[PDB]
Structures are given as C-alpha cells and as structure tokens.
C-alpha cells in the first residue's frame, strides 16, 4: 500500500494499556498463582502468551473470569512476566532467572525463554 | 531499574491484537457510523483515542456494547482510523484526507490530526 506509519504508535498503545491495568480499568480476568491474584486484560495476555492464546480461544474457557495456574508456578516469576507483557521490560536478575525461564516456558513466551537460555549460558 | 527490553514487543502485541480483531475474537463493542458497523476491543479504542478513553471510563457508558457516532462522521474515514489504531499504518490519500482529519479531530487522535494538517499545508 501507500500508507504512512507512526513509529511510536505501538509503544504508546502499550503504555496506555499498562495505564488501564494499573487503574484496574476494563480488566476482565484474574490469574491465580498459588495464594496471589493478578488482574489483567485477556486480549493482552493472548497477544503475549501462547498458553493464554490457547486458553481464551477455547469456546468454554473464553468466558471464565478466573484462571488458576499450575501450583508449580512461582508468583514472583509470573509478576515479572506480566509486567514484561505490558511494558516490553524484563526484570531479569540472578535470583529470579530460573523462576522467570520456567514461567516463560509454561506461558509459551518464546522470546523471554530465548534471552533466559542465553543469560544462563553466559554464566 | 536494571531491566532489559525487547525492541519488537509492542509491535508484536499490536499485530496479535489486529489478528484477534480480524477473526472477531474477544471484541466487546460495535461502533455504528451511519449505516456501517465496526467491531473492536474497547481497550484498543481507549489506548488510541481521547474520545473513546472518555466514553469507556464513564461509569455508565463503560457497559454499553453499542456506540453510535455523530451522523456527520464518514464511515470510510472511521475505517481508515480504526485500521491505523490496530496497525500504526495510515492510508492517507488526496481523496480521503479531509474526512480522515475531521474524524481524527472528533476521535481526539492528536498525532493523526498533526500529519493531516502538515500534508494539507504542503498542497
């Protein structure tokens, strides 16, 4: 086509979606990780995760307001990944990298799994 | 912070949200423009437009599944802008620039209004 493109549009959209999350605006699901609860937007979860994409395209699970993750999933690892989904920023540290990689593999977030594998290989 | 960043994350998120729109997955509103109907995600509309941001933060309008725009709004201008919201790409042409600018002013999409003003000034 003959379209023009606004370079910062995608980043600005994601920044606004994170603002809606922080104010709990139009969140439509709660992700339960052991004792911890995380509110989010199903569309953003699907856009970032192969696991959530599969869950919310299911004709029955698409209508659930609560999703319980596998009890092996660490709440901190999930929190770091949920923050990454809404910001493009990953808080990867020596003390959390194993829990982050395991959570990213479960959530099917290929690019996060790739950087965790590379950072582990370096050490 | 000490975060790392994935450059393409925001663009990849927007691409997936457009894939959900194209398949009519988790769309939660229909925007009526004269005789024409457009299905979309309230969160994406809010993230792109000052008008939709105001509408869906309203304690009553947040729950509406149908929004009717002002009858002066041109369906083609709206379609071009809805496509821009989900792609960062604007189909700006000599034959549609006046309808696109008027629709962007109504929707409160400042960056689109700015490029339309600049393109009109050049001609």
């Amino acid at each position: 086509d003959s379209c023009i493109q606004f370079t910062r549009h995608a980043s600005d959209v994601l920044l606004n979606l994170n603002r809606l999350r922080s104010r709990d605006i139009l969140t439509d699901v709660v992700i339960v990780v052991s004792r911890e609860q995380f509110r989010a937007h199903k569309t953003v979860l699907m856009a970032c995760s192969g696991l959530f994409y599969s869950i919310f395209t299911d004709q029955l699970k698409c209508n659930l307001s609560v999703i319980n993750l596998d009890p092996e999933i660490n709440p901190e690892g999930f929190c770091i990944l949920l923050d990454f989904m809404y910001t493009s920023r990953l808080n990867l540290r020596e003390g959390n990298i194993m829990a982050v990689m395991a959570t990213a593999m479960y959530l099917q977030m290929e690019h996060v799994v790739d950087t965790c594998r590379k950072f582990i290989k370096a050490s | 912070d000490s975060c790392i960043q994935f450059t393409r994350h925001a663009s990849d998120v927007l691409l997936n949200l457009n894939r959900l729109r194209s398949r009519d997955i988790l769309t939660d509103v229909v925007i009526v423009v004269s005789r024409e109907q457009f299905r979309a995600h309230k969160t994406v509309l809010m993230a792109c437009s000052g008008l939709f941001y105001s509408i869906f933060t309203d304690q009553l309008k947040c729950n509406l599944s149908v929004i009717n725009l002002d009858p002066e709004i041109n369906p083609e201008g709206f379609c071009i802008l809805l496509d821009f919201m989900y792609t960062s790409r604007l189909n700006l042409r000599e034959g549609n620039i006046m309808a696109v600018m008027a629709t962007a002013m109504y929707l409160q999409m400042e960056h689109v209004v700015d490029t339309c003003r600049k393109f009109i000034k050049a001609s």
């Binding site: 379209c3 023009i4 493109q5 606004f6 370079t7 | 790409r89 604007l90 960056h111 490029t115």
Partner: peptide, 4 residues
C-alpha cells in the same frame, strides 16, 4: 511519521 515514516514511509514503512
């Protein structure tokens, strides 16, 4: 704005 750019030419993509």
């Amino acid at each position: 704005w750019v030419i993509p």
